[PDB]
protein (sterol regulatory element binding protein 1A) (Homo sapiens), 313 residues
Amino acid sequence: QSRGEKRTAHNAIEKRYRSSINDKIIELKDLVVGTEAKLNKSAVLRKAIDYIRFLQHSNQKLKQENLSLRTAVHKSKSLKDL
Amino acid sequence: QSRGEKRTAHNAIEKRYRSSINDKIIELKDLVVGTEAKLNKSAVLRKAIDYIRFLQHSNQKLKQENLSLRTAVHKS
Amino acid sequence: SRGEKRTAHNAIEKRYRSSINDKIIELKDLVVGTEAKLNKSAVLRKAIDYIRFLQHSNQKLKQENLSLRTAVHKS
Amino acid sequence: QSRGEKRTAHNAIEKRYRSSINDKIIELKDLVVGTEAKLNKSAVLRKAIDYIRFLQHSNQKLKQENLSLRTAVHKSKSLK
DNA sequence: TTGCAGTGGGGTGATCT
DNA sequence: CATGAGATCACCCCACTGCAA
DNA sequence: TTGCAGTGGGGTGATCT
DNA sequence: CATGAGATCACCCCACTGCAA
Ligand SMILES: [Mg+2]
Ligand SMILES: [Mg+2]
């Protein structure tokens, strides 16, 4: 590659670099405000951060409840002379 | 007010902007791989995307399960 | 035993290699010190140059001491 | 370079390597025992080491002497 | 009402891998 | 990161030399 | 009088640069 | 070590948009 060639190649490289990021921001955008909405990059990332924590918290609550529900039906089976 | 004076000023505005995004990718990073690691931006995003989807399905599945378990409780 | 003889001599050859290598390490400690990392030939190149350097420095000093003593005597 | 070529090359590189050391051990030999004498590698280096130390010690001795001679000459006039 | 901050696209150079 | 290659080192094997039993 | 350690040459793979 | 080259990042400059004064 000559200087101009490196440049031109690098620009195509950098184009691929940008999509590697911008394409994932769109993916995150669709996950947090949906495919139809329009939202700016930092806002999408801000929503993605809080959505993840929300989902993480929910997951914990959902699990705590699943165990309780399971412990409940299990106990329902116990007929033992009390 | 010179063009260059104006380019320089906006340059400071653009760094603000760039950091509005970068600071946030670092936040996502700390959530997916933690603080000690080093992971490029696109990989932080890829992980965050997959983590969200993973949690989304994990949560939906627990919800489905919890429904039955709850109804089982009823039908008992 | 061709082999056993080899193994045994191999130990002899290591002792030998070490007889040269440990000296290069000493020469190295002398010319660039202990913390440095320097390859064998540079250690030797330096040693050679260092000796030549001190040789000339000491000659010059001896001829000058000569002249100084002559002066003192011739006074 | 194929393994075969790399091999052949390496042997010539290693020939150059050895010479870069051996050629110097003989430069040292000549300094410690002379052009004509023959002494083995480790004894040449042992001699080089001790010779350097001696050259170092001598230089210090010589400098001190040089100063004393110089301080001598001075007084040899500086007598007020 | 419109001129700047904000926002984003694309290019470059330095540096990394 | 990859390839490419010369450099550096330890160690291999071989040859031989000379001294200590 | 001679085998065995010592010495040195060159090759080679592993690794560094 | 030396290319070589893609990837990564920050910053550049440019264009445009929307809102605060
Ligand atoms: Mg960016
Ligand atoms: Mg050697």
